[PDB]
Design a protein around this ligand. Structure first.
Ligand SMILES: NC(N)c1ccc([C@H]2[C@H]3C(=O)N(Cc4ccc(F)cc4)[C@H](C(F)F)[C@H]3[C@@H]3CCCN32)cc1
Ligand SMILES: [Ca+2]
Ligand code: NA
Lengths: 250, 28, 5
């Protein structure tokens, strides 16, 4: 996270670290959506142009963390993967359309002060909250700059951007399954996700019921925190029918 | 049932340091 | 990263 701040303890208890087994390293962010299911970006798991194709046995999920590098004894929980499910129409060839994946954990994780699932939006949630200028929150242990690494989880709040502005910022084809967020050059505030943060959650606190909802997944960008560029996020509600289908089936 | 309600915040009626920024942006 | 048990 570039131009963010340290998270408070228990601020993002749904935050998940995807951790490569060998070499030991941060792969991506993710989120906890139930005792048994974690949500992330498909590109965290499958991106053939860079020869990325993880199997279940290649990574671990670390839940309840604050420190990036420490083993947070008696606090974090380490979980193994039972199965990975990538959206079947994820478009890794072109523009990362439908950049979403689910992971089922081998065993259910116990909730605690530090570990608690985020809500997924329904249609009404999305309509109310996905509006230009409304701010959401992005968290992660990724790089602090485009070109180092944080001691603890970072957070930044960022406004949703008007679709034409998003479309005009990039040569990449934007779809309805994406939204963008970030400050404009003229706004004076800064902030973005970066390498290490992808797959993590973009969340909003509903002012109607005071619950946190995962509205996006950190999907892609061009550089990090560049003027006139915006981060792109997978639109979770637009893909909820697929999420439900997977959870219902498996 | 309790999704999205943080044990160290909403469950105990404490607010984090920047959630008010989010609220203030929810203007419609 | 610190080693994990
Ligand atoms: N908000 C940002 N500034 C930002 C968000 C996410 C990323 C992601 C993805 C990202 O942007 N990728 C490059 C890419 C962008 C657009 C495309 F159409 C195709 C490919 C990678 C591809 F695998 F998806 C991903 C890698 C993995 C580590 C960081 N980075 C970079 C920057
Ligand atoms: Ca364009
Ligand atoms: Na920018």
């Amino acid at each position: 996270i570039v131009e963010g701040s340290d998270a408070e303890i228990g601020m993002s208890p749904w935050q998940v670290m995807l951790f490569r087994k060998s070499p030991q390293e941060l792969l991506c962010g993710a989120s906890l959506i139930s005792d048994r299911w974690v949500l992330t970006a498909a590109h965290c798991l499958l991106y053939p142009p860079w020869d990325k194709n993880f199997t279940e046995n290649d990574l671990l999920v670390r839940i309840g963390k604050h420190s990036r590098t420490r083993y947070e004894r008696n606090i974090e929980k380490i979980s193994m993967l039972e199965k990975i499910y990538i959206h079947p129409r994820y478009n890794w060839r072109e523009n990362l359309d439908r950049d979403i994946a689910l992971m089922k954990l081998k065993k259910p994780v116990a909730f605690s002060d530090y570990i608690h699932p985020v809500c997924l939006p329904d249609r009404e949630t999305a309509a109310s909250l996905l509006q230009a200028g409304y701010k959401g929150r992005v968290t992660g242990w990724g790089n602090l700059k485009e070109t180092g690494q944080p001691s603890v989880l970072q957070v930044v709040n960022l406004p949703i951007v008007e679709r034409p502005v998003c479309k005009d910022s990039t040569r990449i084809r934007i779809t309805d399954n994406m939204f963008c967020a970030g400050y404009k050059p003229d706004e004076g505030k800064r902030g973005d996700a970066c390498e290490g943060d992808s797959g993590g959650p973009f969340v909003m606190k509903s002012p109607f019921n005071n619950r946190w909802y995962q509205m996006g997944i950190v999907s892609w960008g061009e550089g990090c925190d560049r003027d006139g560029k915006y981060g792109f996020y997978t639109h979770v509600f637009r893909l909820k029918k697929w999420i439900q289908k997977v959870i219902d089936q498996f | 049932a309790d999704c999205g309600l943080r044990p160290l915040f909403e469950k105990k009626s404490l607010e984090d340091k920047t959630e008010r920024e989010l609220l203030e942006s929810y203007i419609d | 990263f610190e080693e994990i048990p």
